[PDB]
Symmetry: D2
Subunit: 330 residues, 4 copies
């Protein structure tokens, strides 16, 4: 997975992510209303009544809704992404905390926090535990990003030493290694720019670029988390600023096209195809959630505030996996 946030010229914060994985568990757009109640652990029936309604992509396959990303009615945005070989969870909670299953972190935070500081305060009351789930069969190795209405972003990483918080980050996150490593890695690529290099001579030979784009020489094109981070970060820096919410969604999806993974192009060590199942964006000020799918390029949108946020039940929207082609003539 890959993710970033941007700010528009009309003072709106937007966040977007690709979800890259090897299977499509039954996933849909889920609106969780206020006071629905969300479990902390799947093997215990302790429930936190959530203050806030929120909308995002997720699964209803276990006891409480598992949100992969989303935005709440107070403009807080966030996502869980993979963090293989780095994520570390405890067997028992630390003194003064309750255990939480890593897959309920987004649902719990979007249900209960407004600012990135709220999020940091909230997570001190919990210890992530090594609790499995039936969709995957194991606890996935995860890390977490949040962006609030102000545009401030944070990264939360369950490292071997404990929870590592990174404040006021560049608003880009992919997978392993840790955020500091990628932030440092950025420095090796500062020569990657939009501008062409000057012509040179070798002897009596004039040498000029083949066409355009030679300013990017040195940027990698593979789909490793470190390469994905570089592409999302550099193209976030150089893509034109979005003037409004629509341009924000459009631009986010253009930046993420450089990390969109076709089926077959990346295989796991077991030969499973790891691909971009969907791409989503969300806006803190409007509380609109947008998505497109591997099989459908047409962006769909769900407005959180359009619904009865005191509903008794979840409100869900199913994926349309048919390429939604506008016929201009028969």
């Amino acid at each position: 997975c890959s993710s970033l946030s941007i700010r528009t010229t009309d003072d709106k914060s937007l966040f977007a992510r690709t979800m890259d994985f090897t299977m499509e568990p039954d996933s849909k757009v889920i609106i969780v209303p206020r006071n629905y109640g969300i479990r902390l652990l799947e093997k215990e029936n302790v429930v936190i009544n959530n203050s806030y309604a929120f909308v995002g992509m997720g699964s209803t396959d276990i006891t409480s809704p598992v949100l992969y990303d989303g935005v709440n009615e107070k403009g807080l945005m966030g996502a869980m992404l993979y963090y293989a070989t780095f994520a570390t969870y405890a067997d028992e909670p630390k003194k003064g905390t309750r255990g939480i299953n890593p897959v309920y972190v987004i649902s719990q935070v979007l249900g209960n926090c407004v600012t990135v500081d709220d999020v940091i305060e909230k997570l001190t009351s919990y210890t992530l535990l090594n609790e499995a789930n039936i969709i995957l069969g194991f606890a996935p190795p995860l890390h977490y990003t949040f962006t609030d209405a102000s545009g401030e972003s944070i990264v939360i990483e369950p490292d071997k030493t404990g929870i590592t918080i990174h404040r006021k980050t560049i608003g880009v996150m992919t997978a392993s290694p840790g955020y500091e490593w990628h932030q440092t890695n950025l420095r090796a690529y500062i020569g990657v720019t939009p501008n062409p290099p000057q012509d040179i001579m070798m002897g009596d030979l004039d040498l000029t670029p083949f066409g355009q784009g030679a300013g990017g020489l040195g940027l990698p094109g593979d789909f490793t988390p470190s390469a994905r981070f570089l592409r999302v970060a550099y193209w976030k820096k150089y893509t034109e600023k979005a003037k409004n919410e629509t341009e924000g969604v459009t631009n986010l999806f253009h930046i993420l096209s450089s990390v969109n993974i076709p089926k077959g192009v990346v295989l796991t060590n077991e030969g499973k195809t790891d691909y971009t199942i969907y791409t989503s964006a969300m806006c803190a000020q409007s509380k609109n959630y947008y998505f497109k799918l591997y099989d459908n390029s047409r962006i769909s949108a769900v407005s959180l505030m359009a619904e009865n946020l005191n509903s008794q039940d979840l409100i869900t929207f199913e994926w349309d996996r048919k390429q939604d082609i506008k016929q201009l003539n028969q």
Copy 2:
């Protein structure tokens, strides 16, 4: 620009391209009917009557329709793409030939040819001339690709030495240098694969990848024509085969996502933004033409055979530059 063709499992041939440029002159989908007539040179009133109707993207700003790419009623597909520093044209026709403006080549070929052999045979009675056009102010440096209904592809390059023809190619083309150079460059990257490298040790340190995608190590991520050719070619090789026409369009657009250029990421030496204006695909068997735009992710389609192919006038369809977002609620 970047382009490729694929074959589906149900025996269809499709071809697609991105159009990368610094300005958007009035462009639209054009159907040219049979017996419309296409000029050879913009300054002379000699026309060739076209045997075949065709559809594609182009301009109606000069005397005859200028098609950037398209498919004809007999399944022939093709496109003109940039070829800077290589394209060479003459001031006067070679003896035995007529001159032709480089921008009229796709129109003439789609109007009169069925097979890739037909195209090769057809281009021998013409010399490309350095005639300007009002759309750009100069003759753009171009080379040409064609794929016929059988899936065979050719590249035609106006080199300093004369027209260079490559037959039965890999069905990928971007910009400069010439096709043999890119086909040779492929060999340097055969280690770019979907599969992860094996873990190693250094002393007592075990070293494993950060996540997935490390089989791609070495593939460049910049937008030079050589890097674009590599990415299209390798992702064409490893993306899952399309089962049908709709999977074809979807897969073509996923492979081209890797060479989709966001505005601001590539600047020319004049400071102009070079970005992916549209992405199109077309199918030899159905004669359907499909496109999406920088500002509009939803794919539209025009069927050539749905129209009156003996119509007197061009039939056109205008771009919809609004992001066509499906609203799932209210």
Copy 3:
């Protein structure tokens, strides 16, 4: 600069480094005998008596010899290397420590320590201070590597948070960033191997490498400290094991050939050439010190033990900057 250690199959440990800089202050091979004495600070009179004799490259331009690298009579080896933007020193010593000038660290450690644990204990007794020196005009930003006769290596980095010690490392060190960063970066390159990739097809086209060496695709060739680290580490991994001390020296100099910088190839932002001034190797068991220079490919050697270890003066050997070409005929 770049550095590594290796172990031979006859149980010897060797260490080598390049010295890359923009000018050559008066440098030479220095033997410091036992009980000679070394200052901790230029501005204070305290002289620490050294228990052990040592040899290495260094300067005699300040009060006590400054060794850039070397080996002592107990087989402890070490070197100081650049650490730009990371090294940070204090104005005053911490409670219960003595201040030390960064450039006197190698002289103090070689003079008084045998194992890497000894080095770690010795350093707790000191605080590195921001004291300048006359050779450069400022306190240079440095980090340190040591390798004892057992072949265990450590890295000591004066970070913003305090002294960071890395134990039992891979025995490679260049410049910034920190050792943990580079050791993590190794993981992105585990696909760099001696073995060629298998042939592939694209359609009917068979693709095979140009020659040999394609297993290394992905490895960077520039002279940045991260690129230098990767090349030293991967080439350390795959270069044939040395069977004796002479092969050990030979192999070290071959591995470092991949990070040997010709004059003019790397300029600072003032346009000064940063080049490899010398390359040195040393062996814990023999106490031999070997070196070649930019202008002289012939390796020269100095034996520590051959000299009077109780000498009452330094013993120095001057550089021969003339290419030492053996004339095979008149």
Copy 4:
């Protein structure tokens, strides 16, 4: 193998090469005197009298001396390097030519040519034949480079279409593909320079290089022939001009250190180590021949003109594989 020529400030031309191979057939420095005579073919009796004496590295294991590279008494320099998958030889000579074994081309040309013009005229008189030899057991795939005393260089490549000649080249040659391919590939890397990139911001984060060297971002560091060509060419361009013959040798060897392959680092698909067996340089004006070996960094020199050029027998000099270490103690 890798090769280049340079011109000194004092107007001397020098040429150098590495020899990279998987085995070391008995090789030495050979002076071939005038009128010694060189076979064209092993299976036919004709010996061609050589007008000129020459010196270089080679083999005496077959009928006539086989020189791998060398310089003649009129200042012509040249070498044969590998050209896998591209070299194409005939079964019979073309009408009007004599057949020649590919391994005898250097001896015949050095024995009889002065200028690159002469070399071209000479090669038009031959057809390279698919004749084997008892050193390898097969006709090795080869291509050839020559530099005359004026400093003009040519490349001669036995392609499938016939001999291809490239005149006044940049004075760099490695292995496959053909010279025009590599010369075009140089254009993709014109952004590889000695100078650092400017610092950038990302949000509030200031990004600066780790150290020095970041102008080189993009240059590959693997040992394939295309990567070796880029490193030799770019470092020939930016390495300071050699002021005299001795600096010329030193600089050539520094440039070639970037393509010096340690044993173990490159294996063939038959698991053989391909490594740099020797590195040689030669000077057209002095007719001095210089070399170092994998196991001995000290350069030896042979002067052609010092010998009796009308001697009846070869004059040879054996390799000294012992690392020739200057012992400084006394």
